[PDB]
Amino acid sequence: QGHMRIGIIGLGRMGGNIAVRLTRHGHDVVVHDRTSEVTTSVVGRCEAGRATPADTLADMAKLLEGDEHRVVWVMLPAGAITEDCVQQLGGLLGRGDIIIDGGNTYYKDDVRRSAELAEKGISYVDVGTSGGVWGLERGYCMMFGGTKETAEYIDPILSALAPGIGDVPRTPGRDEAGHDPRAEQGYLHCGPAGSGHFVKMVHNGIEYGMMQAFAEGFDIMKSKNSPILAEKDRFELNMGDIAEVWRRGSVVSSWLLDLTAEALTRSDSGEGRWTIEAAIEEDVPAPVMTAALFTRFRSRSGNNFAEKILSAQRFGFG
Amino acid sequence: YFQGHMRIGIIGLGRMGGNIAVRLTRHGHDVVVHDRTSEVTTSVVGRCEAGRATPADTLADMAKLLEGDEHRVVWVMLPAGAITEDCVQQLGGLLGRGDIIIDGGNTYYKDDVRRSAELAEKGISYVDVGTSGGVWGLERGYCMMFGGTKETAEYIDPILSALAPGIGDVPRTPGRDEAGHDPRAEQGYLHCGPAGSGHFVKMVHNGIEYGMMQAFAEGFDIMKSKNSPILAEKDRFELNMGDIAEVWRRGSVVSSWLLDLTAEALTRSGEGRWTIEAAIEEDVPAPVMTAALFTRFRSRSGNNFAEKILSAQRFGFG
Amino acid sequence: QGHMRIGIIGLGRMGGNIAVRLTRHGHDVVVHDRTSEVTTSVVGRCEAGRATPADTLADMAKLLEGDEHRVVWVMLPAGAITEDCVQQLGGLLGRGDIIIDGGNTYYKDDVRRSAELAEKGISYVDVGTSGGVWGLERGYCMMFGGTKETAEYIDPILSALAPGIGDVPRTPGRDEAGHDPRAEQGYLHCGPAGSGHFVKMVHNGIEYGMMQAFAEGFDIMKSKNSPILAEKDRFELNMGDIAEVWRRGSVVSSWLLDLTAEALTRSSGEGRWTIEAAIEEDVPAPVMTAALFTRFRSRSGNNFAEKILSAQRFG
Amino acid sequence: FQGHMRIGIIGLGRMGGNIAVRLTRHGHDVVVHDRTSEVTTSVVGRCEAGRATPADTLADMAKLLEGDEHRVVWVMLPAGAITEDCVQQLGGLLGRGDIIIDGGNTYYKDDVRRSAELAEKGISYVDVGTSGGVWGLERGYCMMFGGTKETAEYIDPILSALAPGIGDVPRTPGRDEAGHDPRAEQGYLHCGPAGSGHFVKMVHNGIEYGMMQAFAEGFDIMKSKNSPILAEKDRFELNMGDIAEVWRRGSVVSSWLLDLTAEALTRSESGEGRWTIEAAIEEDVPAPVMTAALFTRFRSRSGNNFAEKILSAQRFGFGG
């Protein structure tokens, strides 16, 4: 059997768990984060002799040396940190090396980085990783984009980070056709570099739409017992019992509903705007997603302006 | 202490009422079925286990053949509106004091509370049952949200637990019974409250369903339109909808029964308005569901008016 | 020839001003508010000797007695207050008397009240009054509903409060049949009782839509100099100068823009009823819906989704 | 200033020719040229005698404008490649000091790029968003322009001529203090460097589209209050024209759009908003009303039928 070696930059609640799961599947990791505390923490959390701490990115480039290609998975805050790290890695890594980006990066930035790194020979892969904390125990749903050769090369570590066939039944109609079978295992090559983060962005948009639908549904259910109604028109409904009964054989059953049922038994903001850009770039209406994000995408000045205008309308200046 | 089976009449033998009768017979219960079409009532008798389904020709024949039990239970699943109202009135005329009348259709919950009062005048117990599952519910169980008196709920508990999916393989939500909640919700059927609350919960359920469905719809639309010719090939991605839908079922946030239906389809009404009406009655904002409803409403005049105003703005009248 | 007499219940910044304007057009008013101080204050602001104060509603009903019908304009906080006042006036007033409702009442409530008061022989009129504080000097845009006979009866007291033909240029094509000419004066009989507050509701919807359009436009303008953009892609625009230049022959010139230009150089969820109308008639209203949900927000609906997302990414 | 100026005008459409006619009516001289010689001579005939000179080519008017301190050329052509080609041809023909005004609907980034390109040739570039349409010939054009302060102060006569003026529009209380551009009270405003004029014109068009859609759906609700979809007991047959008219007198919705709506209802009873939404996205600014107004202009062939297909499969299953 063969195992692979991956560097990992950014050791948060997803990068550290990615490293731990990679070590649990036999692979070697070279980890590094801004705070050495969490770096040593994930080194202690990984399998014995499978995680090596790196103090700098030069240290990681030195510790990834060897025959096979050096793959570096970057899970840093999206924005300037990720861009700086990717440029520094393009400076440090060699020809055949691979730069994977798992952050919440703009997909156009991924296309630009791939174009910039192809000149230096470095292959660039963009990965949207879904699962959060459970991915360490239940596998990560990964939508990635890159070259076919790099995808076939990096397939081992992705199949290690993937959930697998798991408990989910196969949907009828996936037989014999021209589909990517790896999709049934939790990870999918969506296309060239940038497509993985694009489909991750649309995935998050759908997630926010469903989340807001749940929010207003449960809010209607709660407000059915509000004082604004007559007692003869009130229902004191149990939110937890409804969220629990909905989990079994209903049209609304989902993972979001499982989270909702677990939460009800216990008691920036414009991240979606990129999606609606892709919506207006393609002349496709997206009213539900737009409303869902504008429930949380709010401007204080845009509101106090209109409020001052209305107060001047009905009360004047003084 | 219940170790036998029950006897229920069923009026309205469609693709859900007939499935309910067949599922009751497969679970040991006896049914007395009748429909407007004699062919289909004999058909659903032929679809049930031998000796467990008895055909009735009129509602009087059903009320007669159902005598003997402690309470005659009559489940009516007819088109909501005038048909179901006429049937409930005829049953209130035919049934006696102890008898129970269950309404499984998509009736307005206000009509449910009205019928409940009117039949409580005659001593007849009225129960409203929102049934979610569609055709699948025949084999996978029906998620049921029902409202009625507590005694009647305890009486019809066998048939509701029979039609329900059950505990199943779905994992229990941590923190459930420590607080002493309703355990029957863990089987797929929940007593929501007085008569009318079950159809209310089912209505909000279908509103959330429409919201999530529209979210998935515009998400996959934004995905498909990445390969539309309205963009330059420099800015196009030829994404595979089936592969994306399949990879999303493996531990992603958008994993849902709706996503299962969407994946299967890609590899191959009335209650949203009432939910928005309840939201208006309770002064709760529902942007996602309001937009999902406005996707159903389409006015060509709403845009033609503004376009004519703009044409007059930039071209004038005379 | 003659002048008319009106009772006024509710003397806020709108009722007191309509009373004062009615007195400035020669009409007599009988005023009353819950706080006696503001009642005796509205008295005195009116024309001398033409405004009389009332202490109770029975006192007003006694002070309105005479040959012609007793008209009572009610401008109270919409809800239970206005409903209770109208139900009291239904008992105090008699046959033929007129009850005007100027508050922000649900139009279905207006239809119901009209049906309830028609049995007692009392005519009911619903008036949506637009203008606010500016209407005292510039007249009130009034959209009312009631009986045609009642509409023709209260025409003097509405033409007094109306702005008139004014300096506003006439729109070409306004000399055919089926056109109410009084609409060119600022007051219009929309239809039966309830239609006035209905059209006022849609008017407020349009107002909020335009207000949010202005807000988003000026937001996009001011944020062109925000540090989130590179310096080579930034403009330091002047909000007041733009609001001023837009007043002179632009497509966006409006009264809202005039208020905006005066405010810039100076530096709950009631629209949902509109939405219900749009839902009842299968009419898409995306712009009004977005404008409303900018101001219509739910505490539980927001913190619930935020808790679900926090559970998703952190547990 | 006690004289008039001479300006060339390229693109004699329903606004370019009207701009030339309004400039000549205010005493200025114009040198006009269009691809169609017939409409060129027509615009010459529509202007005051001796104040409009026809030109057959761009070089002809470039030679006809010589002698002046700076040759000013106003271009109102279809935005895109036509205007770009014309502007670069003028950059090739005109010399250092001359002024190129762009009155079309050009993207403001194109304006800043053209300004940077022409500033190296010494040519001053100005972008002028012109609002008013065909009415501006009689009522004046609301102009939001961007350029250097020098070229702004130079072409100030022709802009103040095309502007509507102070007029009968009441002054805003509180405009007597310092720090304000007084020319804004005349109908034209220097917004900033080149490109800012078309930017604010774009935001202006976005607000226009928002208010237009608001009026549209409002009148739709009103008209549908008498729809057959409602019971007879819940219907109002409202008069749209009368409502639009009564709204013009001292209501909150009184506007020029309302005047156009009322004039249209007496007869029977657009790419700037997308770039405005793009600017809002670039600046992390929410624009719900404008985004909804834009989505009303889009049509989704699959967005609704896909959800309906999924629901049909939910309640009926996949047969085969």
Side-chain angles (χ1 to χ4, degrees), chain D residues 243-262:
Chain D
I243 294 173
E245 271 302 314
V246 70
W247 277 355
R248 303 186 61 218
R249 315 300 201 278
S251 73
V252 203
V253 304
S254 65
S255 56
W256 169 250
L257 283 187
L258 179 65
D259 299 354
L260 288 177
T261 294

PDB file of all heavy atoms in Angstrom, chain D residues 243-262:
ATOM      1  N   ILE D 243     -57.052  58.246  -9.835  1.00  0.00           N
ATOM      2  CA  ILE D 243     -56.134  58.047  -8.717  1.00  0.00           C
ATOM      3  C   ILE D 243     -54.779  58.672  -9.025  1.00  0.00           C
ATOM      4  O   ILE D 243     -54.196  59.381  -8.193  1.00  0.00           O
ATOM      5  CB  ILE D 243     -56.005  56.548  -8.391  1.00  0.00           C
ATOM      6  CG1 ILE D 243     -57.335  56.002  -7.867  1.00  0.00           C
ATOM      7  CG2 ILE D 243     -54.891  56.313  -7.382  1.00  0.00           C
ATOM      8  CD1 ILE D 243     -57.348  54.503  -7.673  1.00  0.00           C
ATOM      9  N   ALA D 244     -54.260  58.422 -10.230  1.00  0.00           N
ATOM     10  CA  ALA D 244     -52.991  59.022 -10.624  1.00  0.00           C
ATOM     11  C   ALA D 244     -53.071  60.543 -10.602  1.00  0.00           C
ATOM     12  O   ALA D 244     -52.107  61.217 -10.222  1.00  0.00           O
ATOM     13  CB  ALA D 244     -52.584  58.525 -12.011  1.00  0.00           C
ATOM     14  N   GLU D 245     -54.220  61.101 -10.990  1.00  0.00           N
ATOM     15  CA  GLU D 245     -54.371  62.552 -11.002  1.00  0.00           C
ATOM     16  C   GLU D 245     -54.430  63.116  -9.589  1.00  0.00           C
ATOM     17  O   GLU D 245     -53.734  64.088  -9.270  1.00  0.00           O
ATOM     18  CB  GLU D 245     -55.620  62.941 -11.792  1.00  0.00           C
ATOM     19  CG  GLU D 245     -55.357  63.131 -13.268  1.00  0.00           C
ATOM     20  CD  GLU D 245     -54.295  64.180 -13.524  1.00  0.00           C
ATOM     21  OE1 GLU D 245     -54.364  65.262 -12.902  1.00  0.00           O
ATOM     22  OE2 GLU D 245     -53.383  63.918 -14.335  1.00  0.00           O
ATOM     23  N   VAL D 246     -55.258  62.522  -8.725  1.00  0.00           N
ATOM     24  CA  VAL D 246     -55.390  63.029  -7.363  1.00  0.00           C
ATOM     25  C   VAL D 246     -54.076  62.887  -6.610  1.00  0.00           C
ATOM     26  O   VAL D 246     -53.784  63.674  -5.701  1.00  0.00           O
ATOM     27  CB  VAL D 246     -56.552  62.323  -6.631  1.00  0.00           C
ATOM     28  CG1 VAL D 246     -56.219  60.871  -6.342  1.00  0.00           C
ATOM     29  CG2 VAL D 246     -56.895  63.050  -5.345  1.00  0.00           C
ATOM     30  N   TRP D 247     -53.249  61.908  -6.986  1.00  0.00           N
ATOM     31  CA  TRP D 247     -51.955  61.751  -6.335  1.00  0.00           C
ATOM     32  C   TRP D 247     -50.976  62.862  -6.689  1.00  0.00           C
ATOM     33  O   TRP D 247     -49.992  63.055  -5.967  1.00  0.00           O
ATOM     34  CB  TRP D 247     -51.348  60.404  -6.708  1.00  0.00           C
ATOM     35  CG  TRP D 247     -51.844  59.274  -5.889  1.00  0.00           C
ATOM     36  CD1 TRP D 247     -52.679  59.342  -4.814  1.00  0.00           C
ATOM     37  CD2 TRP D 247     -51.531  57.892  -6.071  1.00  0.00           C
ATOM     38  NE1 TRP D 247     -52.907  58.083  -4.314  1.00  0.00           N
ATOM     39  CE2 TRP D 247     -52.212  57.176  -5.071  1.00  0.00           C
ATOM     40  CE3 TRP D 247     -50.740  57.190  -6.985  1.00  0.00           C
ATOM     41  CZ2 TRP D 247     -52.125  55.795  -4.957  1.00  0.00           C
ATOM     42  CZ3 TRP D 247     -50.658  55.819  -6.872  1.00  0.00           C
ATOM     43  CH2 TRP D 247     -51.344  55.135  -5.866  1.00  0.00           C
ATOM     44  N   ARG D 248     -51.211  63.590  -7.781  1.00  0.00           N
ATOM     45  CA  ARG D 248     -50.270  64.626  -8.188  1.00  0.00           C
ATOM     46  C   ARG D 248     -50.332  65.858  -7.296  1.00  0.00           C
ATOM     47  O   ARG D 248     -49.383  66.650  -7.292  1.00  0.00           O
ATOM     48  CB  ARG D 248     -50.528  65.041  -9.635  1.00  0.00           C
ATOM     49  CG  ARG D 248     -50.456  63.915 -10.646  1.00  0.00           C
ATOM     50  CD  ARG D 248     -50.593  64.476 -12.046  1.00  0.00           C
ATOM     51  NE  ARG D 248     -49.508  65.405 -12.345  1.00  0.00           N
ATOM     52  CZ  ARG D 248     -49.651  66.520 -13.053  1.00  0.00           C
ATOM     53  NH1 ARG D 248     -50.841  66.860 -13.528  1.00  0.00           N
ATOM     54  NH2 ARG D 248     -48.604  67.304 -13.273  1.00  0.00           N
ATOM     55  N   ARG D 249     -51.417  66.040  -6.548  1.00  0.00           N
ATOM     56  CA  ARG D 249     -51.644  67.263  -5.779  1.00  0.00           C
ATOM     57  C   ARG D 249     -51.330  66.991  -4.311  1.00  0.00           C
ATOM     58  O   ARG D 249     -52.193  66.579  -3.536  1.00  0.00           O
ATOM     59  CB  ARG D 249     -53.076  67.755  -5.958  1.00  0.00           C
ATOM     60  CG  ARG D 249     -53.584  67.746  -7.393  1.00  0.00           C
ATOM     61  CD  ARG D 249     -52.739  68.619  -8.307  1.00  0.00           C
ATOM     62  NE  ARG D 249     -53.468  69.003  -9.514  1.00  0.00           N
ATOM     63  CZ  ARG D 249     -53.597  68.234 -10.591  1.00  0.00           C
ATOM     64  NH1 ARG D 249     -53.048  67.028 -10.621  1.00  0.00           N
ATOM     65  NH2 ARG D 249     -54.280  68.670 -11.641  1.00  0.00           N
ATOM     66  N   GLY D 250     -50.078  67.225  -3.930  1.00  0.00           N
ATOM     67  CA  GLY D 250     -49.713  67.221  -2.526  1.00  0.00           C
ATOM     68  C   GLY D 250     -49.697  65.867  -1.853  1.00  0.00           C
ATOM     69  O   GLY D 250     -49.897  65.789  -0.636  1.00  0.00           O
ATOM     70  N   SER D 251     -49.467  64.797  -2.603  1.00  0.00           N
ATOM     71  CA  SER D 251     -49.280  63.478  -2.019  1.00  0.00           C
ATOM     72  C   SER D 251     -47.794  63.144  -1.966  1.00  0.00           C
ATOM     73  O   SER D 251     -46.952  63.838  -2.538  1.00  0.00           O
ATOM     74  CB  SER D 251     -50.042  62.412  -2.812  1.00  0.00           C
ATOM     75  OG  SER D 251     -49.406  62.141  -4.047  1.00  0.00           O
ATOM     76  N   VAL D 252     -47.476  62.056  -1.263  1.00  0.00           N
ATOM     77  CA  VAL D 252     -46.081  61.656  -1.126  1.00  0.00           C
ATOM     78  C   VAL D 252     -45.540  61.022  -2.400  1.00  0.00           C
ATOM     79  O   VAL D 252     -44.324  61.048  -2.628  1.00  0.00           O
ATOM     80  CB  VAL D 252     -45.905  60.682   0.052  1.00  0.00           C
ATOM     81  CG1 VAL D 252     -44.471  60.696   0.546  1.00  0.00           C
ATOM     82  CG2 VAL D 252     -46.864  61.026   1.183  1.00  0.00           C
ATOM     83  N   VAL D 253     -46.407  60.470  -3.247  1.00  0.00           N
ATOM     84  CA  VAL D 253     -45.968  59.756  -4.440  1.00  0.00           C
ATOM     85  C   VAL D 253     -45.947  60.685  -5.647  1.00  0.00           C
ATOM     86  O   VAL D 253     -45.716  60.239  -6.777  1.00  0.00           O
ATOM     87  CB  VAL D 253     -46.864  58.535  -4.717  1.00  0.00           C
ATOM     88  CG1 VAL D 253     -46.902  57.617  -3.505  1.00  0.00           C
ATOM     89  CG2 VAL D 253     -48.260  58.981  -5.107  1.00  0.00           C
ATOM     90  N   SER D 254     -46.186  61.976  -5.422  1.00  0.00           N
ATOM     91  CA  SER D 254     -46.140  62.941  -6.512  1.00  0.00           C
ATOM     92  C   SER D 254     -44.728  63.025  -7.077  1.00  0.00           C
ATOM     93  O   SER D 254     -43.766  63.274  -6.345  1.00  0.00           O
ATOM     94  CB  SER D 254     -46.604  64.313  -6.024  1.00  0.00           C
ATOM     95  OG  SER D 254     -45.712  64.841  -5.058  1.00  0.00           O
ATOM     96  N   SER D 255     -44.608  62.809  -8.384  1.00  0.00           N
ATOM     97  CA  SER D 255     -43.306  62.736  -9.031  1.00  0.00           C
ATOM     98  C   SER D 255     -43.483  62.949 -10.527  1.00  0.00           C
ATOM     99  O   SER D 255     -44.602  62.991 -11.043  1.00  0.00           O
ATOM    100  CB  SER D 255     -42.626  61.393  -8.754  1.00  0.00           C
ATOM    101  OG  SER D 255     -43.451  60.315  -9.161  1.00  0.00           O
ATOM    102  N   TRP D 256     -42.350  63.087 -11.221  1.00  0.00           N
ATOM    103  CA  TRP D 256     -42.381  63.160 -12.677  1.00  0.00           C
ATOM    104  C   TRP D 256     -42.810  61.828 -13.280  1.00  0.00           C
ATOM    105  O   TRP D 256     -43.519  61.796 -14.295  1.00  0.00           O
ATOM    106  CB  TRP D 256     -41.013  63.583 -13.212  1.00  0.00           C
ATOM    107  CG  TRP D 256     -40.880  63.439 -14.694  1.00  0.00           C
ATOM    108  CD1 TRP D 256     -40.115  62.530 -15.364  1.00  0.00           C
ATOM    109  CD2 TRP D 256     -41.541  64.222 -15.695  1.00  0.00           C
ATOM    110  NE1 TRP D 256     -40.253  62.702 -16.720  1.00  0.00           N
ATOM    111  CE2 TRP D 256     -41.124  63.734 -16.949  1.00  0.00           C
ATOM    112  CE3 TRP D 256     -42.444  65.289 -15.651  1.00  0.00           C
ATOM    113  CZ2 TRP D 256     -41.578  64.277 -18.149  1.00  0.00           C
ATOM    114  CZ3 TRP D 256     -42.893  65.827 -16.843  1.00  0.00           C
ATOM    115  CH2 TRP D 256     -42.460  65.320 -18.075  1.00  0.00           C
ATOM    116  N   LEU D 257     -42.388  60.718 -12.667  1.00  0.00           N
ATOM    117  CA  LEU D 257     -42.873  59.411 -13.097  1.00  0.00           C
ATOM    118  C   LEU D 257     -44.384  59.315 -12.948  1.00  0.00           C
ATOM    119  O   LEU D 257     -45.061  58.720 -13.793  1.00  0.00           O
ATOM    120  CB  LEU D 257     -42.183  58.302 -12.303  1.00  0.00           C
ATOM    121  CG  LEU D 257     -40.748  57.956 -12.702  1.00  0.00           C
ATOM    122  CD1 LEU D 257     -40.272  56.728 -11.945  1.00  0.00           C
ATOM    123  CD2 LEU D 257     -40.652  57.733 -14.201  1.00  0.00           C
ATOM    124  N   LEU D 258     -44.935  59.907 -11.886  1.00  0.00           N
ATOM    125  CA  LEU D 258     -46.384  59.914 -11.721  1.00  0.00           C
ATOM    126  C   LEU D 258     -47.057  60.764 -12.791  1.00  0.00           C
ATOM    127  O   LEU D 258     -48.151  60.430 -13.256  1.00  0.00           O
ATOM    128  CB  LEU D 258     -46.757  60.417 -10.328  1.00  0.00           C
ATOM    129  CG  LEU D 258     -48.262  60.482 -10.060  1.00  0.00           C
ATOM    130  CD1 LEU D 258     -48.875  59.089 -10.082  1.00  0.00           C
ATOM    131  CD2 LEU D 258     -48.544  61.181  -8.745  1.00  0.00           C
ATOM    132  N   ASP D 259     -46.420  61.864 -13.197  1.00  0.00           N
ATOM    133  CA  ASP D 259     -46.976  62.675 -14.275  1.00  0.00           C
ATOM    134  C   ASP D 259     -46.998  61.898 -15.585  1.00  0.00           C
ATOM    135  O   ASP D 259     -47.997  61.925 -16.317  1.00  0.00           O
ATOM    136  CB  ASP D 259     -46.176  63.969 -14.425  1.00  0.00           C
ATOM    137  CG  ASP D 259     -46.216  64.828 -13.174  1.00  0.00           C
ATOM    138  OD1 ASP D 259     -46.950  64.471 -12.228  1.00  0.00           O
ATOM    139  OD2 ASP D 259     -45.511  65.859 -13.134  1.00  0.00           O
ATOM    140  N   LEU D 260     -45.904  61.195 -15.895  1.00  0.00           N
ATOM    141  CA  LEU D 260     -45.883  60.344 -17.081  1.00  0.00           C
ATOM    142  C   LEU D 260     -46.940  59.251 -16.992  1.00  0.00           C
ATOM    143  O   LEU D 260     -47.612  58.944 -17.983  1.00  0.00           O
ATOM    144  CB  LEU D 260     -44.496  59.730 -17.268  1.00  0.00           C
ATOM    145  CG  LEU D 260     -43.380  60.666 -17.728  1.00  0.00           C
ATOM    146  CD1 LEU D 260     -42.057  59.921 -17.790  1.00  0.00           C
ATOM    147  CD2 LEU D 260     -43.720  61.275 -19.079  1.00  0.00           C
ATOM    148  N   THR D 261     -47.104  58.658 -15.807  1.00  0.00           N
ATOM    149  CA  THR D 261     -48.101  57.609 -15.623  1.00  0.00           C
ATOM    150  C   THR D 261     -49.511  58.142 -15.840  1.00  0.00           C
ATOM    151  O   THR D 261     -50.342  57.482 -16.475  1.00  0.00           O
ATOM    152  CB  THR D 261     -47.962  57.003 -14.226  1.00  0.00           C
ATOM    153  OG1 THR D 261     -46.707  56.319 -14.120  1.00  0.00           O
ATOM    154  CG2 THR D 261     -49.094  56.030 -13.945  1.00  0.00           C
ATOM    155  N   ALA D 262     -49.799  59.336 -15.321  1.00  0.00           N
ATOM    156  CA  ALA D 262     -51.120  59.925 -15.504  1.00  0.00           C
ATOM    157  C   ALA D 262     -51.372  60.268 -16.966  1.00  0.00           C
ATOM    158  O   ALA D 262     -52.468  60.027 -17.484  1.00  0.00           O
ATOM    159  CB  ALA D 262     -51.271  61.165 -14.624  1.00  0.00           C
TER     160      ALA D 262
END
